[PDB]
Motif scaffolding. Sequence first.
Motif, PDB file in Angstrom:
ATOM      1  N   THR A  68      40.741   8.383 -12.490  1.00 49.05           N
ATOM      2  CA  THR A  68      41.602   7.372 -13.335  1.00 49.05           C
ATOM      3  C   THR A  68      40.313   6.290 -14.268  1.00 49.05           C
ATOM      4  O   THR A  68      40.461   5.924 -15.315  1.00 49.05           O
ATOM      5  N   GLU A  99      45.654   2.922 -11.466  1.00 53.42           N
ATOM      6  CA  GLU A  99      46.302   2.859 -12.785  1.00 53.42           C
ATOM      7  C   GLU A  99      45.539   3.313 -13.816  1.00 53.42           C
ATOM      8  O   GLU A  99      45.135   3.937 -14.805  1.00 53.42           O
ATOM      9  N   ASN A 100      44.029   2.160 -14.201  1.00 50.03           N
ATOM     10  CA  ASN A 100      43.837   1.841 -15.314  1.00 50.03           C
ATOM     11  C   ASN A 100      42.451   1.420 -15.203  1.00 50.03           C
ATOM     12  O   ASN A 100      42.350   0.861 -13.880  1.00 50.03           O
ATOM     13  N   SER A 110      38.659   3.003 -27.606  1.00 44.15           N
ATOM     14  CA  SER A 110      39.350   3.592 -27.877  1.00 44.15           C
ATOM     15  C   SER A 110      40.272   3.758 -28.803  1.00 44.15           C
ATOM     16  O   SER A 110      40.612   3.567 -30.391  1.00 44.15           O
TER      17      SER A 110
END
Length: 199
Positions: A68, A99-100, A110
């Motif tokens: 993760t 999850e993140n 990004s």
Amino acid sequence: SQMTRQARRLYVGNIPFGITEEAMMDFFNAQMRLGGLTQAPGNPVLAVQINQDKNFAFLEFRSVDETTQAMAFDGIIFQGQSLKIRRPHDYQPLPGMSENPSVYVPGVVSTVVPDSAHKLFIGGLPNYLNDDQVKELLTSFGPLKAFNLVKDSATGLSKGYAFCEYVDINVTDQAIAGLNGMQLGDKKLLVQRASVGAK
RNA sequence: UUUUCC
Ligand code: NA
Ligand code: NA
Ligand code: NA
Ligand code: NA
């Protein structure tokens, strides 16, 4: 373990041509340690499987949590290329497991550029510019929140257009003013919000 | 010149 494997693997796209599985593993193991993301002694990345013809890799990590955290490397430059880091398409978050990523990697931009008010299109870029150089052109105006240079999926060659989003919404108009209409040989840059010319 | 397996 058997049940967590899907939560211990990541897709990595846009990898450098000719890269070896070992070179990729060494890169990620070092970056994880240098960034403060590694959660124990020894290597967080156990294995890398490369598909050379299709230009992607899958990393396998020793732990769910380190997998993760490694999502925070999406967009990291490796040999000039923005690595596209994604979950496997069959990934399902586990119970009680996050999850993140919880960390930020300084200077990593990004590749995920959602359609939005100030998303920019940059067209007409010379095709010899790699991801790193286009990112640098845009960073001159201000820090980026997200960026992607579009490549031919079969050859890896730049298609000469990119998308980005600045951290500061107000830099958008500064980049437009500084770049729109710039002449480069046969090409003329078109820099405008991507919503203007999207299909 | 509107982001790609087991
Ligand atoms: Na590529
Ligand atoms: Na730190
Ligand atoms: Na490809
Ligand atoms: Na294609």
